[PDB]
Amino acid sequence: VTGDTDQPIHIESDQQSLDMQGNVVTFTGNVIVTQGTIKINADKVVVTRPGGEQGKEVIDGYGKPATFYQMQDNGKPVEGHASQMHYELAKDFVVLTGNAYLQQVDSNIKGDKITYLVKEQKMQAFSD
């Protein structure tokens, strides 16, 4: 949605590590990255800030598969998955690579209980 890329990025993970200089930050274990309605799930996320320069951050997520979600202004969520997710913050886009897949969702429901009709009958034959 409009404004997602102005939001803080939140990262949750089981483990965290740093390289010696501190400009590469690695997360592992059910990593969840959110920024407004953007959500990236992965086994490993690497955040790189070349030269410690704020704004130049790159987020890479790896998984089997890593997943991606965002709500769009038009109300349809976008969801996808790939082996890797690449999100350079200075840019306006993310890159999915490795058996990448992306879909749009045009109708959706939420509740404690949902009942869904699995039997369709578009045609029917009667021998009588």
Binding site: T5, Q7, P8, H10, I11, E12, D14
Partner: peptide, 18 residues
């Protein structure tokens, strides 16, 4: 503007700006 990046450790509950 650059946005803050905040990481939370799921085991400790502790969060920090990275």
């Amino acid at each position: 503007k650059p946005v803050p990046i905040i990481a939370c450790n799921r085991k400790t509950g502790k969060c920090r700006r990275i």
